[PDB]
Design a protein around this ligand. Sequence first.
Ligand code: NA
Length: 97
Amino acid sequence: LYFQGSLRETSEGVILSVIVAPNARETKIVGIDGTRGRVKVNVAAPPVKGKANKELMKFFKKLFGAEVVIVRGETSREKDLLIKGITKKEVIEKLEL
Ligand code: NA
């Protein structure tokens, strides 16, 4: 039930709602924001030239084994990621690893 506040399953896959902090020591999940319903993700990339977006997508593509696109928030800290062709059950399993 922990990550469920940050996810919903559409016909296309799962929209994972995140809030990023760039120039981190490691790209990783550090928590959840219970009011915003977003996973707190640290991203080990500078927020310039799209590099934090790229690193974020790379991390989740590797985690989920699925294409990940930013559907909203390309220029925001609050980003919605579509994990294409995956179920919510599969995403929860991988986030809980
Ligand atoms: Na960026």
